[PDB]
Ligand binder design. Sequence first.
Ligand SMILES: *C/C=C(C)/C=C/C=C(C)/C=C/C1=C(C)CCCC1(C)C
Ligand SMILES: CCCCCCCCCCCCCCCC
Ligand SMILES: CCCCCCCCCCCCCC
Ligand SMILES: CCCCCCCCC
Ligand SMILES: CCCCCCCCC
Ligand SMILES: CCCCCC
Ligand SMILES: CCCCCC
Length: 264
Amino acid sequence: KNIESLFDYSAGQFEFIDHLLTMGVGVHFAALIFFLVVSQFVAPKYRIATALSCIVMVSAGLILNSQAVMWTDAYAYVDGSYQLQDLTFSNGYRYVNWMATIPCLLLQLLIVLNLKGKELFSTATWLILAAWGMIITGYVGQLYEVDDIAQLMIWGAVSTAFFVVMNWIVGTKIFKNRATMLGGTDSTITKVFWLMMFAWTLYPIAYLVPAFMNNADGVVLRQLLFTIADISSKVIYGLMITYIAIQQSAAAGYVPAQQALGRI
Ligand SMILES: *C/C=C(C)/C=C/C=C(C)/C=C/C1=C(C)CCCC1(C)C
Ligand SMILES: CCCCCCCCCCCCCCCC
Ligand SMILES: CCCCCCCCCCCCCC
Ligand SMILES: CCCCCCCCC
Ligand SMILES: CCCCCCCCC
Ligand SMILES: CCCCCC
Ligand SMILES: CCCCCC
């Protein structure tokens, strides 16, 4: 079970969560349109980094819309508060989105990093492997967020071990391949790494909400952190990857990338 199913919610708490999720759908699909449009101004060897953002926007947007539908269908406003009608709302569908979107977010980083060939394939394999372990162990720990907080923290500790290893591999490859990047994007890519580390750390914090704020307000706070983390890790992060791909495109002489930057 999950802590969401434990509480009734005031109209203010319930509708705030609903608007957070609905706004998340709108923001992800709004970025989707932008990424599709701007991808033509990216050189062919970087265009797959922009395509990966489109895939992330589609899958993140569809699953956020599924959760807003489940949120509305699970509770009804009875006797002055929103009460659970159906055992249907699960944050586990976020975990399947994460397993879908995390590899795409990692791959588009490696591409603008100018990883190629054997090093690109092998690095992607280990990063996806480390992400798989982080998601599966975290998903099992999330099963005990109501019944046994101790198991939530023990599985979260193992999941964090995968998280630290994944970031070490990413930081290692950035430090090693920064110099190959054009147009000053070698400076930009490590700030993207800092944003990635800040944004991805918001997820384990929301994961631990049942352990330090197990009430209706903690449920609101958790969806708030997820909303901030999604927009940061997918939309803002994707905009920076796209800027890097366009900047390196223009630096290599790709003409339509140069007009796009001339407008700003
Ligand atoms: C768009 C969604 C993204 C980038 C999700 C990222 C998720 C994580 C970095 C998850 C991290 C976790 C741990 C490090 C420990 C506790 C369990 C997890 C799975 C929440
Ligand atoms: C040419 C670069 C392609 C990069 C794609 C790498 C895919 C490697 C797949 C590794 C298998 C990991 C299985 C974990 C998923 C459950
Ligand atoms: C690129 C170098 C980044 C180094 C960051 C080190 C942060 C260490 C984390 C300590 C725990 C913080 C938990 C919020
Ligand atoms: C937990 C953050 C790991 C950062 C790795 C940096 C490695 C650079 C050589
Ligand atoms: C309640 C509005 C949430 C918007 C979060 C945006 C985060 C950007 C860093
Ligand atoms: C840059 C080579 C294409 C990447 C395929 C995932
Ligand atoms: C070069 C791929 C990194 C290996 C991680 C174990």
